[PDB]
Amino acid sequence: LGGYMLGSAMSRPIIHFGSDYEDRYYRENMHRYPNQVYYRPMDEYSNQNNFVHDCVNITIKQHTVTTTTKGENFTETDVKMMERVVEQMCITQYEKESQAYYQR
Numbered sequence: 001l002g003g004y005m006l007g008s009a010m011s012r013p014i015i016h017f018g019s020d021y022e023d024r025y026y027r028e029n030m031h032r033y034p035n036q037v038y039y040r041p042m043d044e045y046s047n048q049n050n051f052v053h054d055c056v057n058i059t060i061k062q063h064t065v066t067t068t069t070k071g072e073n074f075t076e077t078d079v080k081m082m083e084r085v086v087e088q089m090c091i092t093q094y095e096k097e098s099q100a101y102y103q104r
Helices: 020-029 050-068 076-096
Strands: 005-009 036-039
Touching: 005 076, 020 076, 036 050, 036 076, 050 076
Parallel strands: none
Antiparallel strands: 005 036
16 A cells, blocks of 8 residues: 555445345444445546456455454455445445546
């Protein structure tokens, strides 16, 4: 992270993976999980999928390293749960700021 930008905390979106089990699964763990995401400003690349898939990785990958620092090691299902959320979150930032950026 040579700088990037922290957007803010979002409103904690929720993903209905398709099990009432997996509904509790996220709902309980959503406190330990991220609620903010990390992007560059729109100054270089501003690409509907690409700005997403890089921020989502940067957020969850940083979250990974920040938790290896407490001896914690996440798993694919936890990370796929995070991805759906962190994707919805960076898309929200790429509306609320980008809409003002596209007011010209």
